[PDB]
Amino acid sequence: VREIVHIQAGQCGNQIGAKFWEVISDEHGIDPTGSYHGDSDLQLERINVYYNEATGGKYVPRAILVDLEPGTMDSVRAGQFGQLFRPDNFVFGQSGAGNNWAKGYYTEGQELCESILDVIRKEAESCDCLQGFQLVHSLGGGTGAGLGTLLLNKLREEYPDRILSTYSIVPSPKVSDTVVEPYNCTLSVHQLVESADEVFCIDNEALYDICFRTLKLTTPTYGDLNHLVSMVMSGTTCALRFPGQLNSDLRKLAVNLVPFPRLHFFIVGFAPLTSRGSQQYRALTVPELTSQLFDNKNMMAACDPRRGVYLTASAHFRGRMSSKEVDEQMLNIQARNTSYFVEWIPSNVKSAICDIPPRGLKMAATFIGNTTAFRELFTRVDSQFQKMYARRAFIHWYVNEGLETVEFDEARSNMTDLIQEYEMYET
């Protein structure tokens, strides 16, 4: 009884959310009509984690959907799992996205915020217990970055105790899909640092790179890209859903991985990943799993760990397996590469094992880590922001909404201090 509330915002959040709800529906074995048709009683033990039950044995997910324009909403309606979602949980506006952070936060944000909050209050107060919230949104856009952070602050006010774990999309450094991203990203960073307990950063360039290097897909579409992200959310909350030899929920993750309140940005990785034709040659076991997890190419964020150093890291293993072999790998990988860990924190690598692996895979693992290599990510957006801010023109679109120019100075100042915060702990 550790119910988790799912919240989606914007274009990216829904399409990732739509693909995410397919996977856990498959793992528990939920028919698209909402009726249970699975294959094991273990699926019904703690189905309360993600799904609610109606009168007619028809499982409805704890999902809330938010957008400024209905274009994204209707695509979800026609999706394969479209009938599953609760009809009243769809909350949407009737105005263009605008791709403006100030417009999304202030003008249309306030109108939707009051209606959205009561929608969440329906789901929040309908469970015997409520562990935390889970947000999927984009930072380069205007609706997810703007309205999502507004909802994030309000959620903290009403429910301070609960874990506000979020999944975010980081703008690409080489070529990106929006000009005004450095404004939107920097402004959202200031809200995210103080409010959100746990933030996972995901970059599209790594996703394209992983598919080309490993899976050998010539034309990897968004369906493939969102699916790789879809594993990670399923893996993290799996400890709640299934038994194991060492349980580790979200609150365990934050305690171990967060040494200081402001250093909580994380990198994630998933294993095993193999080309469809290559799998026959592989000898998938625990030692092979550890090889991919600590390999820098499997990281889903374009921040090479070797350029920085690690502080904390946590790994989960799924599947019936010897506990000893898992524990030995944590020791060997830590002692072998001591140059990338801080001396003043021993035992930087957490381990946990869960009984039931996902479909098709005899055992799978999930990696979540925290490292100073994020200083590369924030330097890229800072250098672009200064070139943005010197040419004071794009501020025009933000001023008309009502944003004061001092906020841009404030947003960079806090984010600048975040950069040097990672710098000093390297010593």
Binding site: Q11, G96, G98, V175, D177, V179, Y208, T221, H396
Partner: protein, 430 residues
């Protein structure tokens, strides 16, 4: 769901309007009578029975061009109220088309536009078509734009208008009218696109292999661009792009707004079999100066911001590789104070071909609208031509007699000079 209203003024606007609406009907599958043998609500309204009615208004101060539609095949589709015709045209005079004859009909047309807006619950912007050289395109268009600005305020007013050609010209008084329309447009317009006939003639002769084009061929090429821009709102795609999204990224300043247009692939039926036309080929062709619909070389200037729209068999991964290869081109210039510069849109609905058309059936297509300082080359040419005629006062009496005070001539000259400064100080670097 959400609606866009199209407004056409002048012979050119109505002529382009004819080509644009025939493409919409074929794409959506609507018979010319309004019946059928989705995104219909965006451009069309359901009359109650089987017929569909479009959201358009046709305006001209002379009946000939409007009466062609009234007697034409498409006459059943349109509402008689939407077809508004004056009595006598402006005779290539801005003063006549603004003060004396324009004000006879301005409030009549505005009622019909406002009446159409009542049915548009999700109206997000307007589309307006001009010919700068014509009297009605400039004089009447300025009066309509000024009214709509106060009538509706923060509603996007996007314009797609015909710029005078560098050397090809059909009206002597053309430099006078274009400058006068420049002053009214620059403050009120949210964003205005430029195309010129001289560039289209060369494109309609070289790439599309037709030796003897008419206005009819050029109008269909214009129609393709408008359909591509509105496709992201009409149909599904991996990356939806709205009018507001276009407005924010393309314009860096208030007065720099002017973008340019391009389209690819533009090819004949024969050459289609020889080329695969993947994402790499179409994107590379968009950047050559030959494909510009405005006859100005981008190499003279620099690029501020660009937008690409992809239709058909396009995978997002291949788009990033194509644009990344674009970035490696030393032949392309960008200002340092704008590193990203790109927004991409991918839509699944492929282009629609026309019976007796000029284009082959390409499975995928791409459209580009970009902001560049190269347009300052075009403004200088018009500025120099005007000065020679005004220095000897070659046509002032015609304008003054029709309500114009002569003080307007230096003021419209001054604002254009300020605008040329605006494009230059943007081109400066720090």
């Amino acid at each position: 769901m959400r609606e866009v209203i199209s407004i056409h003024v002048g012979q050119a606007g109505v002529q382009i309007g004819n080509g644009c609406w025939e493409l919409y009907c074929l794409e959506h599958g609507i018979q010319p009578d309004g019946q059928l043998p989705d995104a219909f609500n965006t451009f069309f309204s359901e009359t109650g029975a089987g017929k569909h009615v479009p959201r358009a208004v046709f305006v001209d101060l002379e009946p000939t061009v409007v009466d062609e539609v009234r007697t034409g095949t498409y006459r059943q589709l349109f509402h008689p109220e939407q077809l508004i015709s004056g009595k006598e045209d402006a005779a290539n005079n801005y003063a006549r088309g603004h003060y004396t004859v324009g004000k006879e009909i301005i409030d009549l047309t505005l009622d019909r536009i406002r009446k159409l807006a009542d049915q548009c619950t999700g109206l997000q912007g307007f589309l307006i078509f001009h010919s700068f050289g014509g009297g009605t395109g400039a004089g009447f268009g300025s009066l309509l734009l000024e009214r709509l600005s106060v009538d509706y305020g923060k509603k996007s007013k996007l314009e797609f208008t015909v710029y005078p050609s560098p050397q090809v010209s059909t009206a002597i008084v053309e430099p006078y009218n274009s400058i006068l329309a420049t002053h009214s447009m620059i403050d009120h317009s949210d964003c205005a696109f430029m195309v010129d006939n001289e560039a289209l003639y060369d494109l309609c002769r070289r790439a599309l292999d037709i030796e003897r084009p008419t206005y009819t061929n050029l109008n269909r090429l214009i129609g393709q661009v408008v359909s591509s821009l509105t496709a992201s709102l009409r149909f599904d795609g991996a990356l939806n792009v709205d009018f507001t999204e276009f407005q924010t990224n393309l314009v860096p300043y208030a007065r720099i707004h002017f973008p340019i247009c391009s389209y690819a692939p533009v090819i004949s039926a024969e050459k289609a079999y020889h080329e695969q036309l993947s994402v790499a080929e179409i994107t590379n062709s968009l950047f050559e100066p030959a494909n510009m619909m405005v006859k100005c070389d981008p190499r003279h200037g620099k690029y501020m911001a660009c937008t690409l729209l992809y239709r058909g068999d396009v995978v997002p991964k291949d788009v990033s590789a194509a644009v990344a290869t674009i970035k490696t081109k030393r032949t392309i210039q960008f200002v340092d104070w704008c590193p990203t510069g790109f927004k991409m849109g991918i839509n699944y609905q492929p282009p629609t071909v026309v019976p007796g058309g000029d284009l082959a059936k390409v499975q995928r297509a791409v459209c580009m609208l970009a902001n560049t300082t190269a347009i300052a080359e075009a403004w200088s040419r018009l500025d120099h031509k005007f000065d020679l005629m005004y220095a000897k006062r070659a046509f002032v009496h015609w304008y003054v007699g029709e309500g114009m005070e002569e003080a307007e001539f230096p003021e419209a000259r001054e604002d254009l000079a300020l605008l040329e400064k605006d494009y230059d100080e943007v081109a400066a670097e720090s």
